[PDB]
Structure formats: structure tokens, C-alpha cells
Design a protein around this ligand. Structure first.
Ligand SMILES: N[C@@H](Cc1ccc(O)cc1)C(=O)O
Ligand SMILES: N[C@@H](Cc1ccc(O)cc1)C(=O)O
Ligand SMILES: N[C@@H](Cc1ccc(O)cc1)C(=O)O
Ligand SMILES: N[C@@H](Cc1ccc(O)cc1)C(=O)O
Ligand SMILES: [Cl-]
Ligand SMILES: [Cl-]
Ligand SMILES: [Cl-]
Ligand SMILES: [Cl-]
Ligand SMILES: [Co+2]
Ligand SMILES: [Co+2]
Ligand SMILES: [Co+2]
Ligand SMILES: [Co+2]
Lengths: 445, 445, 445, 445
């Protein structure tokens, strides 16, 4: 049996050490009485769309921030990231004839898991930066001491962001007639921009023809659903935002539509798995090179006992060099055991190079190579390459090398070469979308 | 005041001389108690679509036989002609973003007006062939004597043909997923066929995208309306099939959705105008080189006194050499007097050459030139080039010269070089449709 | 293996003796080249709706003439009969929340099976009247001698009637806003009329609310499909109108959407079964008191070998006194053998009394009692009471006794007390519809 | 010319005195960079729906809190209030055949205008309570001193509330199949509950019939738009949340879809009018007994110079005794000057009795009487009674007397008898909705 607090009896990784247990417990009670970010009905609806993807009838697009910050809390940033998602989605939808389920790493992607629990600079040692929901990026004691009030500031940033996203998605901004306005102005003067603009023209023509057929007022052309997801890492936050469905009594983590377990916190006897075990949300697990096939099946026994087809997303991040070698055996096990899973590629977290200095690089060529091999492996095994899961930005930067143009080492993107990881820019997100699109067309031909 | 028989008190052209007035009157009473081909509601609906065309928001496609015959009464022929109409319609609809109103010269286009009321072969003189509804094509007395029973045979051919057309249109045959199946198998191995096939592919993609958007079950994609029209020439037929609307009391000629007055029977004091004066149908008049602008306005005063915008179609057939010279002055008059009319081009009946032998030729190059000039003239005057009105066939023939390939002088098409006129084949209908389509796109750009 | 003519090698009942085999063969060739009444696509669509009924997700309404006549060939009669069908359909649809599949015994219900092959009046003996498609009702030699030309007159009446029905159904007459106009003016001044008028008001309110919700332009509210059916009795007619589907090569009897085998012609080794064996249409068989359960299963093996769920309608006509006793055993056999069938009640042909004089009576109370027991029997056995199959008229008569008002013995209805059977009038059809409606609501509650 | 800060140069009522101008200015800059509650596109859409109401084709329902509080910030409270709004809306929509535009006094209704700028208790005098966005209800210095940080707490409560409302409205909670679940469990055991339950049953039947017609998947049945409104009283808040539309450059107050000017702050030369003058939102003005017809027209010249038909809502709150006397002359002036306005009744703020003690009472009988007279007055003058504007709650209380049951003087509702006003409960909101509904039906009959 399970409760929202049953995770507290399990062994646990990646949790901060709060200096005042009582203070933390008061912030948790405050948050427990605040309204949920999502309504349980919607999580059920996302499960229904996951099941469509799992059965080969749609494709999952999951994208957004590496970690949202308090210092970057702007309408512009939320809008631009959502623009890139819509662009990708329409490119894939039109070229492949395939519904795309859109899920943003947004409105609650704050907590960060770290390779080390502390950090050392010239003889001074401080707790590690774990994301703004926990503590601050500044290398100094007041910054790094965990502050339970940050829970509430993360929540407030999240209701603001999701409120705006829901407005954009339902209120006209995502209407297919807006197809051109989704292109950020810095995608121009290149074969790729020309390419989007031509596809957009084709969409204009499609809608004009639908209008001439008598379908101009269909609500389906004017609005779309956008869902939210983050890593369920800080379980105090997740617990306070877990709520019983009014109609059914069943527990849902209402911090987000979908939650996932990170690669370093997926211990089968651990707290993170125990949390997600007993919520009704669609969920995901990060599947990196350390996962073997026995371990994977046991994990699925726990996270999806009834083998429901819209429950579990397996998010494969292996490295461009390792996916060929590791994935086949994992799929084969799932097929053999008759499991229903949604297979996604995270082509980014397995392709990060750390220099001795701590400076992080991601070669976009390797990101593409992992993706291409993901699809090849599915192709060979008879299973379905079901989704993509990327870190990206609508800001005019270049954080991943070996793209089309050389990188920007801005300072605005220094956070994304040290404490966070390099994100795809809009050029890169779009080229990815076109590659996915051709590949999907070929699968379905 | 007006009745279905008020035409009988007017002077009249092009009527046959029946040998037994009483016998004719009995066939007329028989036909008067038979069911109507169309229901008044539908004629009102066509008026509504005419008004859309008249206002520049749609385009009228009217096509079919020169004159239907009793010897060519086959499902195959009806289907193939309707295929060509759907092809044309979709080509225009997709490329121009414009609804097309589809009207077939079918299910009652039997009566034919003739330049002479008799015919002479080597010293023997016989009444002229006036179409199978009147008499027979054979040069012999029994054939040429008007037979009132032929009224009923025309009616029976008409209910059969329209029944089938309504079945095709509503029952799945006209569903947009059928776009490829409308291409007749003899349109192939040419840039034009390649062109239709590419447009059809674009339509497949549009529908697949609509499916992926959640619109796959829209009834608008699956069915279309098809309307019928003929020249109201034999007024005995027309009267017997004129019926009062159940709800409103108002008279409708229920032989067809739309009726038109031919160029030789449009005398303002004449029977034909008097007939159509008092029916509620959408109607048309043939406007050839002999029409002046004073005459045209008076005709419109009679045929559309209330200046209703879906009532009157002006069907301009001038000759490739004469349209430039004649049309401008006609449009200018209408504009000046504020009249609402639907302007169509009949590019065929003004471009017929009669050799001394009676053998008829139509150069397709001239057909295209009249069309191009029609649009140019509208362009120059500020008015709307609203429709096309052609004779065509889905049979694998070539009756009009100077197309892409040289003609067929079959014998199957000898009727269409003597008593009837050469029809456009499917290649020719399609090239026309593509020209119309580019022109409409340019008008609306 | 099967052909359209393979029935001619089988033993056969109820066929007329034509006096000139050659003449008959010429009329058959004429008819073979005439267009079909229906298109194969539509027959497939009706199979799809039958499958919905068979699975308990819709209800089948089949109604129309006992036998159409040449003397009663009027738009008014076709319209009024169709009005009664729409009335019944909407009453059932609204009160029961259940789609109704609408099938008219119209546009080809001409041939009649007879208890005797001749008739005797005061010493003179003549071939029996077999319906106007064969011969004439007049007791005299010229009338009664089979005339093959009557085939063509039946065909022409059929294209006229179906053309009009398709017009009504698609062209605005069947639009749900017309709900009141379907009530014939002689249903008034009674609790039953009041009842329809209230339901119609409820439908007005429903549509107004749909309009206020933004659904006013849905095509689903404006049009409906209407299908046709008759007894496939005169196989010469049926063969000439059997045609290969263009796309699939497969044979369809295109005289009508659905054909059925009568109770007296359902010999398993016989011609009628052999005809329908190899057409793709939805079909029916009349199941009267003489049918046993072994015989029924063998018949189904032949008529539906693949056990397709939209293929076969079993039309049960037992008598009010006999249904209780006979039906249970028939259903039990079907259930046991896993057969997919659409069960309908014909509550009329088993409830006819013939006086010594030949004068036919049908007590409406018995018609209702057979219906009520049909549903009771299904209720008891676990199967689905799937449809109703009645003879009815929109004319202002009373042919069945023991209704609400006493009968009309008009002369207009003397055909329906001798050579044909008494039909339900509109009062009676409606009361039936309300009973069916309550019963269906209760089944689904 | 106009800017978001141009109000600061005008004379102004009802503003608090902040103790630190600099601190306030910092909180304002913080809020200025936070995301907007609404997107400009949506405000334009609400203008479009206002225009529908103004033209007599819809009805405006505006309801919610008197003033939201920080202590009552729960999902339950937001949900229950929204339930009552949906109930009212559907009752009106179904019975009257009329679209209802739904606007909640929610997600930013914090600031309160007061009759006096201070309050005295037993010799101690303190600044008046102006709502939680300004200061605190507690009678003590720290509470009553204006705190600029409260701006941000109001904003955070607002994004949380609107995020949830948008979720409910779009995500399944407002789906018409939920009609029964909107009834709060304490509306039961009464003719009024029975009444809602019967209407809900009628809605079930309507949807079942739509399903049987093939419309079960229409998005229009599943989602609705919900808009937000408050009094634009604290202009510092409003300015910080005023933002330029991305596409058009035009300014919108993005704190809410609609803003209104209160009765005490509508000075034509004043700050409040100057603020709303130059935003693109739909807006309202409170029109109480002190407004004369000259004054009203000048106010409209300023607030709607172009006389756009979806711009201005006149919210009439006169008193049950005074509406008869005052409104006629106001309407007559508007009619005479050809102004397009949306006329609403606020039947509550003119019907409040203050005892010498400060204890506030509202007699529901008087609330109903003002409403009834509003409609009567419109009826007499030829204008349109366009909306209703009420304070209400989904909590199980009785704050207004003379309803059906005697009041609750809870303490939970003591805020609503002193600093705020008594709200309608759910019984009362519903009875109102049924009265409005009959009245609208009668107007449109
Ligand atoms: N409404 C459809 C199609 C759609 C997709 C994306 C959009 O931006 C807009 C519409 C969907 O959500 O799938
Ligand atoms: N139903 C639409 C679109 C359409 C057009 C042609 C078709 O063949 C099919 C559908 C119309 O009639 O305009
Ligand atoms: N179009 C739907 C609903 C309908 C039924 C009957 C009608 O008369 C009209 C509409 C159908 O055919 O089932
Ligand atoms: N979607 C429609 C109808 C509707 C109304 C209220 C609802 O709760 C649901 C649907 C509208 O917003 O007007
Ligand atoms: Cl699931
Ligand atoms: Cl008109
Ligand atoms: Cl089937
Ligand atoms: Cl406006
Ligand atoms: Co990362
Ligand atoms: Co011709
Ligand atoms: Co019978
Ligand atoms: Co108040």
C-alpha cells in the first residue's frame, strides 16, 4: 500500500540537507493547500494519447529547458520555446501524416540531479547547486544552503508559466493559420528556413482548401493541447502537489501532467520509484547505458503492474557510440515479455563531454547520430520509435557545437556549459524535426 | 401574371410541328403526373451558390453533353463525364482556394436548336433533327416526323441518369479520397497527366493531415452536391415538369435545377423568355455577338426584376475574334445599372466553323483564346469572371482540332461534326481546368 | 461457382410463364444495358450499418408498400410514405438514443408471390396476378398474360422514385428542422398527435441548443441516408440489374440496396437462394412458422458462409399466437452456432385472415401483440430485437381493423384486401414507433 | 495621447498611501517583468462575444467574489464558484436557445473601494481595509499600513486561480456530459433542485441524440471559454500588467480579460477612466443612481470614441426602488445618440442596507425585484437586457436574507457583512438563472 509520504521510508539519492526540518515542514504544509497545476482528468487524457503513440498511431515530442531559473522568468522566453515546439510539431505532423503529442519540459523543471553532492573552489567546499527550487547558483554559503521557501517561488513561477501556455495553446496563438509566426526571426537566410517557409506555405494551401470545402470553423484547426513534464526529483514538492481525484479517489501528482525518474535516481528499492508507483500520471524513466534487461523488466513490473499501454515512457539516452550496442537487448526483453511501452530517444544526456575544467560540450552531429541509430535499432527489432526528448531554447544562441554555425560562448549560456547542459537552438530543433519527419514518413510508407 | 402555359400565347422559335395535337396533349398529361427530377428546395440552394459566385466567392463549372442521345444511355458514359467534372473541380478548388459550384449538362439536355428547320439530301426534303426528345437522327420520314412519345423516353433517361449522379455524388464516389480514381486511364504519358497526379498527391497529403488533426470523419470530405441543367427549348416538356413548391406555392421548373435560354430563342417578347420569367429556378441566357447592351438590360428587367443575386447567369459566347470587341460594352452597361449577374464563358459555340459540306470544326486553341480574353476583359472592367460553360465527354476521342494530338474522325464522333458540335475530351477539359485555376489564383492573390 | 444466370439451372417457384421466350430475352438485354438503381459502394455502406444493428448499437426500420402499382405512381405518394418513415425514425432515435437505419420497401417492390398460380371466377380460369412488373390486376386474358415489356416500365418507375427519394433525403426535406412538416395533416385531434408534436418540440429545443453551442451548420443535422429494398422474386429483373463493382470485380444486385427472399421461395436448393448467394448486397430472408432450426442454420451456411455481421437479416413473421412457441428455438440455435444475424419482426404477414371470399383482414391489435412478444422473446433469450419490417402507407385510409378508429373499405384500398394485404396507416405506424421507442429505451436503460 | 502611466497625472480617488514610494516602485518593476494573466488575442475574442450580446444574439453572465482573500485560496473554492457559473449558464443556454458569455469575478478581484478612507474603533483610528492586494483586514497598524509586497502575492494567487480555471474549462470539467456534477450537493430536497435535475436530464437526452446523429466527438460539447474580470481600482497593479500586443503594437491590460470602473471612481477627468481609455480590452462601468444622461454620454465618448460594439459594458446598479425611475432616461439618451452598449444589471450593489453598526444586509427579494424591473424597463424602451452581474459563492452559506431559508451568520461570512457584501449562494444563483431563463425565452418567443 502507498501514500504520498511513503517515499520517506525508502532509501534516497540526490536530496538536499535542509538546515531546519520544522521550517521545511511548514513550507510543505503551505504548498499542500495551494491549488494543483493540473487537473487529474488531463493526466488521464495524456495517458490516452501515450497509448496512441505506444500503438504506432502518433509520435511524442517532449522538449524544453535543462532547468528553468528564477532569473529567466519571462513571457518572451516561455512563448519562444513554445513556438519552437509548435514548429517541430507541425513539421512532423504534415510530412508524416501522424498526430504529435506535445509535452513541454516547463512549468516545474527546476530541480537538478548532480554527479557530486558538493563543489570545491580553491579550498572552499559548499553544497552543490541543485536548481533554484532548492538553492542558488552563486558559489557562497547563503546561496548554497537549502532554502525551503524556494519551493513556493518554484510553484509561483510554474502557475504563471502554465497559465500562459494554456492561454497560448487554447486562445489562438497555436491556431494553424499562425504557422509562419512560429518561425523565430533568426531562422532565415538558409536552406532550412526556406524549407520551413515552403512547408508553411503548403499548410496555408491546405487550410485554404479546407475553407473552400466548408471546414473553416473547425475547432481542431484553432487550438491544441499542451502538456507539461519535469523530473520528479525533489519529492517534497511532488508530495505537497499530489492530490486525490474528486470523482475516482485515485492519487495524481498534480505538479505536472507527466513526471519522470532520472537515470541516477531509478533505484528499484528507492524513494523516487516508490513515489511514482502509486500516482495515476503518465510517467517516464531515464534509460542510460548502465541499465540491463533484467533490471528494466523488474522496474516495469513496479511502475506498470497492469501493463496499461499509456502508462510508461522509456526515455533512452545511451550515447551515439553505445545505442547500437545496448538498446537491442532491452527492446528484445520487452517484446519477449509482452510489455507495452512508449520508447523515446533522449539523444542529449548520453552525449555530453566534460573537460577536466568542468566545461560541458555537446556535439550536435553526435545528437543526430544517436537519433538516427535509435530509429535504425527500432527498424531492425520490429518495435516502434515513438518519441523524441530534447533540451532546447527559443533564445538566439548556439550552445551545442558542430551544428551549422560555430558556437556562442555568451555568459547567458555559461550556465549551460557548467551547472546545466547545452540546449538545442531553433535551427538545430528544426533540422531535427525534419529528420524525424522523413524517417517517420519512411516508416509509414 | 404567369402560368406554366402562358408561353403558348407568345410567338415562338425552334418548335417542331407535331402531326397529332391530341396525341401530343395526351403525352403531356402523362408526363404532368410523373414525379419531378428535382425538388424546389434544391433549386433554391443552387440560387444561393450562384449568389456566392456572383459576389466573387466561388466559381461555376458547367459541363456536359452537346445533346444526350437514346443510343448512348449507359452508366459508363454518365460516370466518365462526371469523373471529368470532378477532376476539373478539384483542380480549380485546390489551386485557387475557391469553392466550385458543379452543374452538369446532363439528365435532360436532349432538345437541339437548328440553323435551318429542314434538311435536304439529293432532292428529298425532311424536317430537321431537333434531338431525340423530338425525333430521330435518321434521314427518313418515320425518323423525322415529330413523335410525342419521345418526351417520355427523354424523361425516363433523365430519371435514370440523375438517380445515378445523385448516388455517385452522395454515396462515396465523389469522396476526396477518390481523387486519383477520377483520372481516366487515357490521360497518362504526358506532362498534363503528371500534373494531375501531383495535385492529387498534394490532396492525399492534405487529407492525411486533416486526419492527423482529428477531422477524418467530416461529411464535407466525403460528398458533394451535383446540379443539372439544360436548355429549356422544348416548352411542352418544361411545362409538364413545372410544379408548385409544397411549402411556398411558388412555381419551379422541376425538369432540372437550372434552365437556360439559347441564343436563337431569347426574343424578349418570345415564348422562351415568358416560360422562365415566372419560375423560381436559377436560370441562364446565352449571350452571343448579336446582343447589344440596351437589349441585354431589358432582358434582365424581365428575367430578374428584383435584381436577386443568385437568379441570372449570363453565358457569353462570342468567338475568340469578337469577345475583345463585344463584351466590354455589355459589362459596362450592367455595372452602370447596378445589376447582379453571374458571368460565364461558353468558349465553344462562338468558335465553330461550318465547311460548305456542313462538317463542323472547333479549334481548341481558339477555345482557349476566347477563355483567356474573357478573363482579360473582366480584369480590365473591374467585374468578375465567374464561370465556365463547356461541352465535353469522358469518352476516349478527339473531336476538337489543334489540341495536343490530332483528331479522331471516328463515326462515334460523326454526330458531333454534323448535327451536334465537337466536345472537349478529358485532356482538353483538364488543360482548361489548369488554365482557369492559375488565372483564378492570380485574381485572388 | 456463381454467375448472374446460375439461378436458371435451379428448381424455382412463383415464376410466370411468358408466352414468347425470345421477346422476353430481348427485354432482358435492353434492361441489362440500362443504368443501375444503386452503386455498389452504397450496398457496402448498408452492410456496415446492418453490422451496427446486429451488435446492438442501432435499430432497423424497414417499411413501405405491399406492392407498388403503375396506377399509383405519384410524387405525393412517394413523399407521404417517406414522411411516415422519417417520423417513425426520429421518434425512435430521440427517445431511445439509438441510430435508426432507414430502408424503404420502395422503388422496385412490384413482384408478388401468390398462394395459387391461377384464379377462377365463375367458370373462367386465368393466370394469377403477380404484380405489375409481370402482368395486370384486371381479370381478363390480355391483362393476365405475362408481358415482358413490364420489366422496363417497373425499372422506369423505380429510377423516378429513387431519384426523388435521394433528392428528399439529401436535398433538405429530411433536415431535422423539418420535424413538424413530416406529420401528415390527418394525424391531429388525438393523444398520439399531441404526443408527436411534443416530441417534435423537444427536437426543436435540442437543435436550438446545438445552434447556441456552435453546431448549427453540421451536415449531420441536415441530411440522412435512405436505402431501398424489395423481394427478389422475379429473377429476370434481378439478373439484368446485377453488375460488377468497378473497383473490386465483385457482383452486386444493383436493383436495390437490399434484397430479400420470401417465405414461399426460400428452398435451400432453389433458384432464389442461389441468386442471392453470390451477390454482395445486404440481404434478408422471411422466417415464418414452417422454418425449423436445422433448416435455418443450413440456409445461413449458404447465404452467409463467412458469418459476416452485416450480411443477413432474419425477418420473423410468425403470427401473434405462434411467435412465443416458435422463435425461442430458432434464436437458441443461432446463439449455439455463433451466427451473426440481424433479427427483425415482420408482424404483419403472419397475422392475415383470409375469409372464404378471399377478403383479407389484419387486426392491428394482433400486429402489436406479435411485436411485443418478439421483444419479450429476445429479452428472455439474451439476443437483440434488431428491427421492424412493416407494410404502410402515407394515404388517409384505414386498412387494418381494431386500430383506434374503424376501417375504410374504400375501393382505393380494395387492392389491399384481395390481391395485396392491408397496410398500416400513419396513426398506426406512429403508435408502433412509440411502442418500439419505449421498449428500446427500456432495453438500454 | 496615452501611456500606461498617464493615469498618474490625473486626479484620483480610492488610492492607498504607501509609506515608501521607492519600495513600491521596486515591487512595480518586479511585477512589470512577470508574465501576463491573459494574452491580447483573448481580450479581442471577448470583445467579439460582447458584440454578439450587444446585438441581442447572446447573454452575458458575470459572477464571482465580492473580494477574493489570501486566507481563502483553495482549489475547492475556485472549483465550486465555477460550478455555479456553469450551472447558471447551461440553464440559461438551454431554456433560451441563446449563447451565454461566461465571465468570472475571479483571479484578480482583490482591491475594494470604501465609503470612508479610515476606520475608528474606540478612539483608535487606522487606514481603511482596501482588500488584501493593499493591506489586511485586521484592525491594527501593521495590518493596515499599505504593503507593496501584496501586489505580488495578489498576482501569484491570480496565476494559480486562472491556471486552474483554464484547466477546468478546456480539460474536461466543463464538458456538457458533466452537467449533473456541477450541482453542489447542498442543492437537494427542494423544487429548485428537482428543477435543475430535470433540465440536466433533458441535456443528457439532447447529447445522447447528438451521439445517435453522429456528432458525439464535436469539440464544442466538451470545452468552453471562461474569461476573467475585476475592478481596475489599484492602478499600480494594472499598469505593471499592461503590455503591448506582439502583432499589433496596441496596449492591453493583461491582468484580466475585462476590467471595469467602479461607481465611486468614474470621474470623467479622473485617473481610472484615463487608464482604461487607452487599453484595447472589453471594459465596463458601474452605473448607479447618481449618473445622469449627459454625464453618461460624455463618459462613452471617452471610453468608446469609435462606438465599437464589443467595447463597453454598462453595469446598472440602481436599487429595486430606483431602477424604474432612473434607467429609462439613460437608455433613451443612448438610443437617441446611436451608441452601441452592452447593458447589464448588477442587482446587488444598489440593494445594500447598512445598519448604524456597519452590519450590511441584502434582501434577495429586492435583488430579484431589481432584476425583474431591469428587464421590464428594457422591454418598454425597445433596448436589450444583455447581462447579469452578481456576487456569489459556491460555499454552503446564506448571506442574503429573504431567500428560501433563513440566513447563516457564520463568522466565515462576517467578512461579507462588514468589510465586504453579502453574496448569493447556489440556491439563490440558480433561482436567478431560472428567472433570467424564462424572461429570455419570452423576449425571443
Ligand atoms: N487540434 C489538433 C491539430 C493542431 C495541432 C497543432 C496546432 O498548433 C494546432 C492544431 C491537435 O491538437 O492535434
Ligand atoms: N463537400 C464539399 C467539398 C467537396 C468537393 C468536391 C468533392 O468531390 C468532394 C468534396 C463541396 O461540395 O464543396
Ligand atoms: N444524419 C443523421 C441524423 C439524421 C437522421 C434523420 C434525419 O431525418 C436527419 C438527420 C443520420 O442519418 O442518422
Ligand atoms: N462550447 C460551447 C458550448 C458549451 C457551453 C458550456 C459548457 O460548459 C460546455 C460547452 C460554448 O462555449 O458556448
Ligand atoms: Cl493507460
Ligand atoms: Cl437569389
Ligand atoms: Cl458484413
Ligand atoms: Cl469591438
Ligand atoms: Co540537461
Ligand atoms: Co453544342
Ligand atoms: Co404484403
Ligand atoms: Co461587493
Amino acid at each position: 500500500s502507498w501514500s504520498p509520504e511513503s517515499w520517506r521510508a525508502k532509501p534516497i539519492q540526490q536530496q538536499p540537507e535542509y538546515p531546519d526540518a520544522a521550517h521545511l515542514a511548514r513550507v510543505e504544509q503551505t504548498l499542500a493547500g495551494y491549488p494543483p497545476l493540473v487537473f487529474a482528468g488531463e493526466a488521464r487524457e495524456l495517458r490516452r494519447q501515450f497509448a496512441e503513440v505506444t500503438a504506432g498511431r502518433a509520435f511524442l515530442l517532449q522538449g524544453g529547458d535543462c532547468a528553468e531559473s528564477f532569473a529567466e522568468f519571462s513571457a518572451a522566453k516561455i512563448r519562444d520555446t513554445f513556438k519552437v515546439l509548435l514548429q517541430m510539431a507541425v513539421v512532423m505532423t504534415f510530412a508524416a501524416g501522424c498526430p504529435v503529442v506535445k509535452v513541454g519540459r516547463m512549468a516545474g523543471q527546476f530541480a537538478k540531479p548532480r554527479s557530486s553532492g558538493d563543489e570545491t573552489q580553491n579550498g572552499v567546499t559548499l553544497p552543490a547547486y541543485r536548481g533554484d527550487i532548492v538553492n542558488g547558483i552563486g558559489f557562497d554559503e547563503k546561496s548554497r544552503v537549502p532554502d525551503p521557501e524556494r519551493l513556493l517561488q518554484a510553484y509561483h513561477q510554474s502557475t504563471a508559466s502554465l497559465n500562459l501556455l494554456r492561454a497560448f495553446a487554447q486562445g489562438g496563438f497555436a491556431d494553424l493559420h499562425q504557422v509562419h509566426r512560429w518561425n523565430l526571426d533568426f531562422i532565415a537566410n538558409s536552406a532550412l528556413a526556406e524549407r520551413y517557409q515552403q512547408l508553411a506555405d503548403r499548410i496555408d494551401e491546405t487550410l485554404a482548401f479546407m475553407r473552400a470545402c466548408g471546414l473553416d470553423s473547425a475547432p481542431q484547426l484553432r487550438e491544441t493541447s499542451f502538456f507539461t513534464a519535469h523530473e520528479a526529483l525533489l519529492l517534497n514538492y511532488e508530495e505537497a502537489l499530489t492530490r486525490r481525484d474528486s470523482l475516482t479517489g485515485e492519487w495524481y501528482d498534480c505538479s505536472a501532467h507527466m513526471l519522470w525518474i532520472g537515470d541516477r535516481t531509478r533505484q528499484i528499492d528507492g524513494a523516487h520509484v516508490e513515489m511514482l508507483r502509486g500516482v495515476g500520471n503518465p510517467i517516464g524513466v531515464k534509460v542510460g547505458p548502465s541499465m540491463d534487461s533484467e533490471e528494466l523488466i523488474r522496474l516495469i513490473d513496479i511502475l506498470n503492474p497492469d501493463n496499461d499501454p499509456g502508462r510508461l515512457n522509456l526515455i533512452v539516452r545511451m550515447g551515439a557510440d553505445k545505442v547500437g550496442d545496448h538498446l537491442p537487448r532491452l527492446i528484445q526483453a520487452i517484446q519477449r515479455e509482452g510489455r507495452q511501452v512508449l520508447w523515446s530517444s533522449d539523444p542529449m544526456h548520453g552525449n555530453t563531454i566534460k573537460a577536466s575544467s568542468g566545461y560541458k560540450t555537446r556535439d550536435f552531429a553526435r545528437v543526430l547520430a544517436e537519433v538516427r541509430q535509435f530509429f535504425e535499432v527500432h527498424q531492425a527489432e520490429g518495435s516502434y520509435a515513438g518519441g523524441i526528448h530534447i533540451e532546447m531554447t527559443g533564445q538566439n544562441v548556439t550552445e551545442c557545437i558542430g551544428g551549422s554555425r560555430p558556437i556562442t560562448e555568451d555568459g547567458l549560456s555559461d550556465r549551460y556549459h557548467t551547472h546545466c547542459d547545452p540546449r538545442l537552438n531553433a535551427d538545430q530543433s528544426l533540422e531535427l524535426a525534419f529528420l524525424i519527419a522523413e524517417t517517420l514518413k519512411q516508416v509509414r510508407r
